[PDB]
């Protein structure tokens, strides 16, 4: 039973179901990046590389009665084939709770799984927002071709949104205008809501008018930075080999360790719909 040792799977069906539901719940609650990014479909576990595809491109495309105008279809600038990393965390159960949950406390206690899923999703967001340079990945606030813009006028009413107006202007000049999304660091997201004298209206209202796809806040980002993007495909994507799942790492000391897994890669198909400080 619990002495035979190294049984392949300790838990029964319902325990697996409870683990999966828990990790899904905590992930959905604690994820900020995956809310402005359409994901490339579930590929599988076998796949380990994806076609990082484009770098740039613009071509009007025209209208005619018969249809002969010779516009070259957007193909690619350079095929790359980046690889897909893996993100993981791991936790422990005490080999007795799996017994109490079978007699006394009928639903199993899984607080460790939630604690692990939080950190796993934290690393997910940290990867989407930043590179590592230990595998040569590009992050939103790192990638070259960011169209920087100075933004120092805050701590005073006379400013604030003018910076994001300038960001819209710069992105439009590249002929790249659509429904924007804005992500900001806490030190400034809090700064937006001040109720300084002659108040009028708090600023995030105008900002959310000007954004139209949601203004978000993420702690993974550094103190005094923030970005503006264009939400659609053909500019950003998220290749997903496999979403967060729980797996088993063999039984050591009769206890039971597990690990939450998922394999992602952020691929920016147009490093032109990005703006930073």
């Amino acid at each position: 039973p619990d002495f035979l040792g190294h049984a392949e799977n300790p838990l029964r069906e319902e325990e697996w179901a409870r683990l999966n539901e828990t990790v899904i719940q905590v992930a959905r609650r604690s994820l900020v990046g995956r809310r402005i990014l359409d994901i490339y479909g579930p590929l599988g576990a076998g796949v380990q590389t994806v076609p990082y595809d484009e770098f740039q491109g613009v071509s009007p495309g025209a209208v005619d009665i018969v249809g002969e105008q010779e516009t070259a279809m957007v193909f690619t600038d350079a095929r790359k084939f980046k690889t897909i990393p893996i993100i993981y965390k791991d936790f422990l159960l005490h080999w007795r709770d799996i017994e109490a949950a079978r007699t006394h406390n009928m639903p199993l206690d899984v607080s460790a799984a939630a604690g692990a899923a939080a950190l796993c999703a934290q690393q997910e967001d940290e990867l989407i927002f930043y590179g590592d340079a230990r595998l040569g990945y590009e992050g939103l606030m790192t990638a070259n071709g960011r169209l920087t813009v100075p933004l120092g006028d805050w701590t005073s009413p006379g400013g604030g949104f003018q910076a994001i107006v300038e960001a819209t202007r710069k992105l439009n000049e590249q002929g790249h205008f659509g429904p924007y999304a804005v992500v900001l660091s806490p030190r400034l997201y809090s700064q937006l809501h001040r109720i300084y004298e002659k108040t009028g209206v708090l600023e995030i209202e105008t900002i959310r008018q000007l954004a139209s796809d949601g203004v978000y806040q993420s702690n993974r980002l550094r103190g005094e930075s923030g970005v503006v993007v264009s939400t659609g495909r053909e500019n950003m994507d998220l290749a997903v080999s496999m979403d967060m799942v729980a797996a088993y790492l063999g039984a050591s000391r009769m206890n039971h360790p597990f690990r939450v897994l998922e394999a992602l890669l952020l691929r920016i198909k147009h490093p032109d719909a990005i703006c930073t400080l």
């Binding site: 959905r28 994820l31 402005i36 479909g41 579930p42 796809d213 997903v240 979403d243 799942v245 998922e262």
Partner: peptide
């Protein structure tokens, strides 16, 4: 035994 994406489908 499909691909059966689990957590990540958050809109937009």
């Amino acid at each position: 035994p499909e691909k059966r994406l689990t957590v990540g489908s958050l809109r937009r």
